[PDB]
Amino acid sequence: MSMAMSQSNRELVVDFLSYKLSQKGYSWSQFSDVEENRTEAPEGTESEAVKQALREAGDEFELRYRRAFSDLTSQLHITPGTAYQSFEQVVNELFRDGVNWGRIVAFFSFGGALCVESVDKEMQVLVSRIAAWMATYLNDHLEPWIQENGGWDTFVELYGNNAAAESRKGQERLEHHHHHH
Numbered sequence: 159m160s161m162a163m164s165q166s167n168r169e170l171v172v173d174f175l176s177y178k179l180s181q182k183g184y185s186w187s188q189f190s191d192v193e194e195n196r197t198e199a200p201e202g203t204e205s206e207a208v209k210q211a212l213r214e215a216g217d218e219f220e221l222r223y224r225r226a227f228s229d230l231t232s233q234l235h236i237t238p239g240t241a242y243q244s245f246e247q248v249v250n251e252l253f254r255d256g257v258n259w260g261r262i263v264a265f266f267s268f269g270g271a272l273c274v275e276s277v278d279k280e281m282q283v284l285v286s287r288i289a290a291w292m293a294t295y296l297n298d299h300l301e302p303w304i305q306e307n308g309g310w311d312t313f314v315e316l317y318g319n320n321a322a323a324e325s326r327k328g329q330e331r332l333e334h335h336h337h338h339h
């Protein structure tokens with residue numbers, strides 16, 4: 159008997175990773191062929207879920223916790239001889255005190271920095287690794303958690319764009335009340 163999980167989480171590591179990379183100037187990728195059509199009106203077009211949410215939180219994280227993050231990225235020096243263990247360790251402590259969206263996003267970034275550091279050392283080859291190491295920890299040290307707090311749908315409904323605006327809707331309203339009161 160055996161069993162596994164989904165892949166969504168993994169998609170986050172890739173999508174985000176790329177973002178953290180592009181933000182630094184890097185990128186790298188490839189193309190291919192499949193099969194599809196279209197006939198309406200092409201344009202940027204954007205979503206409004208984990209993708210957008212995750213990113214934002216990431217940028218704001220290093221902003222509010224510029225130090226809390228920096229000091230972290232300096233706690234682990236990824237290398238070819240580095241063992242996935244040395245990784246799951248550092249991330250463990252930062253996650254020792256229970257689990258909360260905050261630490262979650264604050265964590266994701268940790269990895270992003272690792273990649274930025276790898277490329278800086280002309281070792282982008284690592285990116286692929288750290289990327290897999292995350293999807294492994296997120297599915298063995300978070301999955302069970304994220305599924306106990308309403309998955310991501312909740313994270314995007316709390317500390318997310320559509321959510322941010324939603325919050326204001328109320329406030330701007332409440333204030334109007336006391337005023338008319």
Ligand SMILES: O=C(NS(=O)(=O)c1ccc(NCCSc2ccccc2)c([N+](=O)[O-])c1)c1ccc(-c2ccc3sc(CCc4ccccc4)nc3c2)cc1
Binds near residue numbers: 248253
């Ligand atoms: O912010 C946090 N929590 S929150 O109140 O739930 C929150 C606060 C703000 C936001 N968003 C607004 C932007 S700020 C932000 C901050 C964090 C995440 C996302 C956003 C969000 N959120 O979006 O989910 C959540 C938060 C922020 C930082 C840390 C944090 C920082 C450094 C370290 S170093 C360490 C172990 C050391 C150690 C290292 C190695 C080896 C051994 C020991 N553990 C750490 C934990 C822990 C929690």
